């Protein structure tokens with residue numbers, strides 16, 4: 001609901017996207033910006049000094065116009081809003097902390113974690129890494145209704161804490177595709193190469209539409225039942241990189257404001273499921289989040305001492321698009337060790 | 340008549356109209372990619 005939170009989180013989304021594509025320019029991308037934003041906001045709760053400022057600025061907050069306390073309350077309100085009951089769309093977001101029982105935590109930290117981020121503190125025996133890994137993965141599998149089963153691949157036996165966020169999304173199209181109209185068709189990987197995919201179709205449809213001639217792309221909005229929708233951006237053949245370079249809060253605002261209703265004779269959309277697993281360490285470094293990974297890490301808001309450091313931030317996401325609607329889930333984990 | 344054919348790489352941005360959150364952002368370069 002927060003205008004300043006929406007602006008920072010969208011700036012972060014597009015800055016993250018651009019780094020992911022730079023890292024792996026030939027790959028599908030799928031990730032949840034709000035899952036990663038919330039996980040790192042959760043982390044910043046325990047951060048102090050340069051570690052803290054780097055995280056908040058990396059999340060694209062203007063600290064000359066907002067404070068850490070405002071940010072945390074904004075995320076609290078976001079989680080409350082996202083997790084409201086709904087009869088139309090399924091959406092849930094949860095946070096948890098898995099902590100070695102022997103690790104002394106500030107009362108202020110665990111209280112704030114629960115109050116602001118809805119997070120319990122789960123005592124976890126990381127020295128039994130296989131069982132600790134199973135527990136965290138089960139938490140994510142439960143939260144994502146089975147969609148994400150292997151967020152944690154490896155877990156150091158000397159892990160002290162893991163912060164986890166998940167998002168679960170299941171929605172029906174306002175205008176669903178008839179499966180009888182789904183046919184094998186070409187999906188062109190390049191001008192010369194294609195793969196055969198099930199191509200769904202809708203006919204005689206009136207939807208928001210914008211041909212962006214300057215950017216050589218077409219934008220359409222398809223609605224879910226509920227307060228969610230999806231912006232599809234279709235660059236002309238071989239213009240994807242030109243469009244990616246223009247991705248920004250300003251461009252998305254422009255697109256949203258330029259859409260007009262148009263009767264579409266035929267719309268063709270593949271039925272597909274894609275997933276990606278990410279090690280976000282180099283990504284977050286590129287966005288300026290550095291000290292939290294170093295021996296100079298200041299996470300003294302968690303314990304009272306500068307005795308913890310991030311080892312790895314991971315993210316996994318899955319997107320399933322089909323005739324009835326969309327299912328998408330993601331989860332983010334912040335692994336923390338002793339320092 | 341206008342035809343919109345997602346038969347080449349495209350982007351998806353799943354948005355919440357209530358909070359203006361971007362739930363998911365995607366580039367489909369290959370729906371059958373390994």
Ligand SMILES: CC(=O)[C@H]1CC[C@H]2[C@@H]3CCC4=CC(=O)CC[C@]4(C)[C@H]3CC[C@]12C
Pocket residue numbers: 003006007008010249252253256257354355356359360
């Ligand atoms: C009108 C509409 O579809 C809404 C849905 C998502 C909304 C966008 C969500 C992200 C966003 C954050 C901002 O702070 C600038 C405005 C924008 C860019 C919003 C503009 C209006 C949008 C595009």
